[PDB]
């Protein structure tokens, strides 16, 4: 180690440290302000990709922010990488304190914005409070809330009108009224996210009315995507579908509207949390409240507070079905981010206990959602859900491991899933193994098509479904040529 | 045409499904029916716990086939068991036809629909079946117009759906008019699964058992004698078989009725048979004394 | 592209071809001393545009990147350069000092909002827009 | 071997291969299970 | 690489420490052989199942 130091090779130094799995050797003396920018960031990345050892990765990240901060120039891209995994309040907090003295407010604003997007949502709510106590100047703190971030993007999307209207026109002109009209409304809405398209709404009012059942609820809900984060004309036009203004129409339309209201506010939801929370408590019934609770959860997403969860917990105990599915989903959305002991215990038993099918679906996905980056606790949950009488619970268990593990691969999680699927000809498990891969293998994004090439051959339509879903998630941001070709035969196969 | 309906997902229990197979095989070819007992849970799920039959008649799958006498009689007794169950619907079998309902059968489905609109007719096929996955379909049964308009997929939501063809275009058309295949899920678990697994505890005696030595000799003789006959073709087989085209090979080197397949098959029975008999005789000797 | 707009172009195309071909074919001139040929056939077709590529870009995989070393500048709140994710080397280029925004935080460059110190140098103005608050 | 650029080239090979090794651990786990899946195909 | 030969001592520049890299590669090289055997084996089972 002394001998590499003499040569001054930053690269050799880190490599010997990397193999030894020792902190002392790693701790810098070849980057104590010896060419400050660039070099730290490669090393963090390497510790993630190369290792599957949680202990080495966490120690190296923590110490590194604190020494780097001290150097002539801190560089933030590296500090964000340490922070998202650990979730430490300190890392961001120390970096901003130096920045206050030099009076370089902009430098700080830049970090806050990035943090919103990348880091775990619950961690983001806590820091806002924390900065006031630490004593950093409000302007940075505003950006860190993220209320500013969404709006700055919104400003661009709305004004430029980035999504073309033309694409939506072909879909509306071409397609008939059947199941097909319901479909169209969701299609245009999803493409034209973050910019207003009232033109579609008013014109094809008729189509919304024609639909019956849950499908009618779904059409009205799509309005909520189009009008995402706005509060100008967007709100006005949406108001009328909700009971808020004229023509609320049928019951399904009222609920798709309250849901669309929540979806627009989503995870900036604070003002909306009081309004929604109250409606759901008093009535604890109806289509209209089912859409509200759905909306309440999305708005609340991440701060992991006990209050909202507890009020929702009762609605499950009361066991009214319609609302039940929305409250079930919602537990998972608020706690999202990091482990919370009460959510894991009440949802496992309650989901297992009920034979109310939609309560069973809501509650089932919700157990997976609460985990993220807490690997080991999930190993327990998944086996128990798989053994049960309910088919749904088997698929939810996969989700549980996928999330807890997403952070770094391991051998453990893939191995667990894999044995169940081969052993038996059971469909529900067989899809589960293959599905689960994409989330965990995320670190080297090539790998998911490697495992899935053998699995896509399977004649079970289940496996074939599960192979496609997995490829989708892993490759999403950084693509692969191999992933594209695997999807083609699934499209071809005639099963639905 | 507009109406606000939901589809019924039929959750069939393991106990219930097996009884439906039992009844349907028995009825052959004459079509037979019965009522389904269950519970209505959630906002669409009708679950079939158990099934009983209404009488076997050549007037089967009819309103007539339905017996008021059976229904009352069972229900008083069921009160005592500590399960008086709801009539979730009715099952029938067609072993003269597929999943296409008969003309009487559509009226009969309707009468059940009046009593409880969460009523379905499940078609059970055991010799008009093309699949060993258990050819069963579910219908609520709604009018023709609903298909034509395209209303019928708006009502079904909360369905996946599926389409199979036991018997041609005529069946497909009948299916589309009805309500097509609405999803069947199964309520099953490992305890029920273990019951079905079984064969014989008698395996206990049998693993140890071996036969008279004269018999061991009969087997060995019969196989060696057999092997002589095929051997003469085998010579040709190894000398030639440049052909890889199955039809030409068959005529040329007696490729069909192949000496390789059969001679291998023969060495393998003889070896395994001798091993288990021999192995058991020796094991028993040491242990009993 | 909108169905109605293109429907106009097709219709126009078809009327000229059919009308001209109708007179041209029927006329008799070959036998005549005028000789412009008894038959003359008249076909006109349209073309549609294809995907545009102004000045080369480098395409690898499905493309989570796509660069060229020769630079142009583009404005903020006007990303019409519709980035692929994981290109840090193209956003801000390799760090700006040609602009008001001078990096004092080096090569941090997210593909989302980068606004470093605007007080180091001034090479151009910076209107504030209250528009994001309005939306809010 | 030296202090020279020879250990720089070796380093880059080393680095990339190490990342690969992890990839390969996963392929071993599948190889073991495929044996049981083949046995299962028969059923 | 090199057969033999010390290049500017163990102590002076610290040739041995950088030098250790070449030997760590002997391990990855040793692994490269099994990977090949492993590839064929996996394929034979896969081809077998696939048919």
UniProtKB/Swiss-Prot annotation, chain C:
Residues 119-136 have a biased composition (Acidic residues). The modification Phosphoserine is found at residue 17. Residues 22-64, 113-136 are annotated as: Disordered. Residues 25-35, 42-55 have a biased composition (Basic and acidic residues). The modification Phosphothreonine is found at residue 13. Component of the 19S proteasome regulatory particle complex. The 26S proteasome consists of a 20S core particle (CP) and two 19S regulatory subunits (RP). The regulatory particle is made of a lid composed of 9 subunits, a base containing 6 ATPases and few additional components including PSMD1. Interacts with ADRM1. Interacts with ZFAND1. Component of the 26S proteasome, a multiprotein complex involved in the ATP-dependent degradation of ubiquitinated proteins. This complex plays a key role in the maintenance of protein homeostasis by removing misfolded or damaged proteins, which could impair cellular functions, and by removing proteins whose functions are no longer required. Therefore, the proteasome participates in numerous cellular processes, including cell cycle progression, apoptosis, or DNA damage repair. Belongs to the proteasome subunit S1 family. This is 26S proteasome non-ATPase regulatory subunit 1. It comes from Rattus norvegicus. The lineage of its organism: Eukaryota, Metazoa, Chordata, Craniata, Vertebrata. The chain holds residues 818 to 953 of 953 of the full protein.
Curated annotation (Swiss-Prot), chain D:
Component of the 19S proteasome regulatory particle complex. The 26S proteasome consists of a 20S core particle (CP) and two 19S regulatory subunits (RP). The regulatory particle is made of a lid composed of 9 subunits, a base containing 6 ATPases including PSMC4 and few additional components. Interacts with NR1I3. Interacts with PAAF1. Interacts with TRIM5. Interacts with ZFAND1. It comes from the Eukaryota. The modification Phosphoserine is found at residue 1. Belongs to the AAA ATPase family. It is found in: Cytoplasm; Nucleus. The chain holds residues 28 to 70 of 418 of the full protein. Component of the 26S proteasome, a multiprotein complex involved in the ATP-dependent degradation of ubiquitinated proteins. This complex plays a key role in the maintenance of protein homeostasis by removing misfolded or damaged proteins, which could impair cellular functions, and by removing proteins whose functions are no longer required. Therefore, the proteasome participates in numerous cellular processes, including cell cycle progression, apoptosis, or DNA damage repair. It comes from Rattus norvegicus. This is 26S proteasome regulatory subunit 6B. The gene is Psmc4.
Swiss-Prot record, chain E:
This is 26S proteasome regulatory subunit 8. The chain holds residues 1 to 51 of 406 of the full protein. Belongs to the AAA ATPase family. Transmembrane segments: none annotated. It comes from Rattus norvegicus (Rat). The modification N-acetylalanine is found at residue 2. Component of the 26S proteasome, a multiprotein complex involved in the ATP-dependent degradation of ubiquitinated proteins. This complex plays a key role in the maintenance of protein homeostasis by removing misfolded or damaged proteins, which could impair cellular functions, and by removing proteins whose functions are no longer required. Therefore, the proteasome participates in numerous cellular processes, including cell cycle progression, apoptosis, or DNA damage repair. Component of the 19S proteasome regulatory particle complex. The 26S proteasome consists of a 20S core particle (CP) and two 19S regulatory subunits (RP). The regulatory particle is made of a lid composed of 9 subunits, a base containing 6 ATPases including PSMC5 and few additional components. Component of a complex with USP49 and RUVBL1. Interacts with PRPF19. Interacts with TRIM5. Interacts with NDC80. Interacts with PAAF1. Interacts, in vitro, with the thyroid hormone receptor (in a thyroid hormone T3-dependent manner) and with retinoid X receptor (RXR). Interacts with ERCC6. It is found in: Cytoplasm; Nucleus.
């Amino acid at each position: 180690f002394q001998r590499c130091l003499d040569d001054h090779k930053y690269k050799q130094a880190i490599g010997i440290a990397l193999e030894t799995r020792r902190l002392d050797v790693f701790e810098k003396t070849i980057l104590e302000s010896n060419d400050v920018p660039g070099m730290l960031a490669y090393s963090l990345k390497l510790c993630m990709s190369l290792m599957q050892n949680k202990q080495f990765r966490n120690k190296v990240l923590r110490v590194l922010v604190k020494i780097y901060m001290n150097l002539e120039k801190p560089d933030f891209i590296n500090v964000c990488q340490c922070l998202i995994f650990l979730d430490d309040t300190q890392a961001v907090s120390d970096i901003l304190e130096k920045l206050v003295k030099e009076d370089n407010l902009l430098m700080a604003y830049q970090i806050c914005f990035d943090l919103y997007e990348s880091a775990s949502q619950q961690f983001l709510s806590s820091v806002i409070q924390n900065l006031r106590t630490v004593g950093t100047p409000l302007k940075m703190i505003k950006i860190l809330s993220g209320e500013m971030a969404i709006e700055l993007h919104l400003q661009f999307l709305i004004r430029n009108n980035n999504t073309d209207l033309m694409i939506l026109k072909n879909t509306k002109d071409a397609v008939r009224n059947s199941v097909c009209h319901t479909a169209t409304v969701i299609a245009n809405s999803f493409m034209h996210c973050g910019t207003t398209s009232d033109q579609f709404l008013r014109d094809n009012l008729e189509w919304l009315a024609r639909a019956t059942n849950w499908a009618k609820f779904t059409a009205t809900a799509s309005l909520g995507v189009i009008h995402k984060g706005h509060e100008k004309e967007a709100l006005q036009l949406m108001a009328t579908y909700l009971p808020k203004d004229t023509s609320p129409g049928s019951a399904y339309q009222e609920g798709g509207g309250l849901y669309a209201l929540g979806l627009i506010h989503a995870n900036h939801g604070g003002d909306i949390i009081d309004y929604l929370l109250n409606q759901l408590k008093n009535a604890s019934n109806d289509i209209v409240r089912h859409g509200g609770s759905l909306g309440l959860g999305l708005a609340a997403m991440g701060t992991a507070r006990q209050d909202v969860y507890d009020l929702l917990k009762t609605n499950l105990y009361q066991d009214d079905a319609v609302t039940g599915e929305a409250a079930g989903l919602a537990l998972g959305l608020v706690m999202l981010g990091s482990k919370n002991t009460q959510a894991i215990e009440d949802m496992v038993g309650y989901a297992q206990e009920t034979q109310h099918e939609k309560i069973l679906r809501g509650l089932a996905v919700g157990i997976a959602l609460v985990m993220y980056g807490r690997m080991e606790e999930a190993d327990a949950l998944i086996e128990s859900l798989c053994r049960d009488k309910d088919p749904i619970l088997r698929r939810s268990g996969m989700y549980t491991v996928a999330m807890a593990y997403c952070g770094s691969g391991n051998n453990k999680a893939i191995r667990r899933l894999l044995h169940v699927a081969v052993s038996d000809v059971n469909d529900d498990v067989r899809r589960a193994a293959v599905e689960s891969l994409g989330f965990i293998l995320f670190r080297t994004p090539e790998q998911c098509p490697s495992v899935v090439s053998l699995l896509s051959e399977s004649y079970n339509p289940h496996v074939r479904y599960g192979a496609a879903m997995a490829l989708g998630v892993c490759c999403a941001g950084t693509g692969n040529k191999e992933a594209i070709n695997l999807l083609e035969p699934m499209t071809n196969d005639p099963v639905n | 045409a507009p109406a606000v309906d939901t589809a019924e997902q039929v959750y069939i229990s393991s106990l219930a499904l097996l009884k439906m197979l039992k009844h349907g095989r028995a009825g052959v070819p004459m079509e037979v029916m019965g009522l389904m007992l269950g519970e209505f849970v959630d906002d669409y799920t009708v679950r079939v716990i158990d099934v009983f039959a209404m009488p076997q008649s050549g007037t089967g799958v009819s309103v007539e086939a339905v017996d008021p006498v059976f229904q009352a009689k069972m229900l008083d007794m069921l009160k005592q068991t500590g399960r008086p169950e709801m009539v979730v619907g009715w099952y029938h079998s067609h072993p003269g036809f597929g999943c296409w309902l008969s003309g009487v059968d559509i009226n009969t489905q309707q009468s059940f629909e009046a009593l409880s609109e969460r009523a379905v007719a499940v078609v059970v096929d055991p010799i008009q079946s093309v699949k060993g996955k258990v050819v069963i379909d579910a219908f609520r049964l709604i009018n023709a117009n609903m298909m034509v308009l395209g209303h019928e997929p708006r009502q079904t939501t909360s369905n996946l759906g599926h389409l199979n063809k036991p018997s041609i275009q005529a069946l497909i058309h009948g299916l589309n008019r009805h309500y097509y295949s609405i999803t069947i899920n199964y309520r099953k678990n490992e305890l029920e699964q273990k019951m079905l697994l079984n064969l014989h505890k008698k395996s206990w005696m049998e693993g140890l058992t071996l036969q008279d030595y004269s018999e061991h000799c009969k087997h060995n003789e019969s196989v060696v004698k057999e092997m002589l006959e095929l051997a003469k073709n085998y010579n040709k087989a190894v000398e030639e078989e440049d052909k890889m085209t199955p039809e030409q090979l068959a005529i040329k080197n007696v490729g069909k009725q192949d000496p390789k397949r059969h001679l291998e098959e023969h060495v393998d029975v003889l070896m395994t048979s001798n091993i288990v008999q021999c192995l058991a005789a020796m094991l028993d000797t040491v242990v009993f004394k | 592209e909108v169905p109605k707009e293109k429907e106009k172009e097709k219709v126009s195309t078809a009327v000229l071809s059919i009308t001209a071909k109708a007179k041209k074919k029927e006329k008799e001139k070959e036998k005549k001393e005028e000789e412009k040929m008894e038959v003359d056939e008249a076909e006109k077709k349209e073309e549609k545009e294809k995907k545009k590529e102004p000045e080369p870009n480098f395409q690898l995989l499905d493309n989570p990147a796509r660069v060229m070393p020769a630079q142009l500048k583009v404005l903020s709140m006007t990303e019409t350069c519709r980035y692929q994710p994981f290109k840090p080397l193209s956003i801000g280029g390799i760090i700006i000092l040609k602009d008001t925004s001078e990096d004092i935080e080096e090569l941090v460059e997210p593909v989302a909002a980068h606004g470093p110190k605007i007080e180091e140098e001034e090479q151009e103005p910076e209107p504030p827009e209250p528009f994001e608050y309005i939306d809010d | 071997s030296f202090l020279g650029p020879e250990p720089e080239d070796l380093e880059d090979l080393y680095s990339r291969y190490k990342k690969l090794q992890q990839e390969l651990e996963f392929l071993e786990v599948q190889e073991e299970y495929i044996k049981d899946e083949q046995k299962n195909l028969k059923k | 690489m090199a057969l033999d030969g010390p290049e500017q001592m163990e102590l002076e520049e610290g040739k041995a420490g950088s030098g250790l890299r070449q030997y760590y590669l002997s391990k990855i090289e040793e692994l490269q052989l099994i990977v090949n055997d492993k590839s064929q084996n996996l394929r034979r089972l896969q081809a077998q199942r696939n048919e």
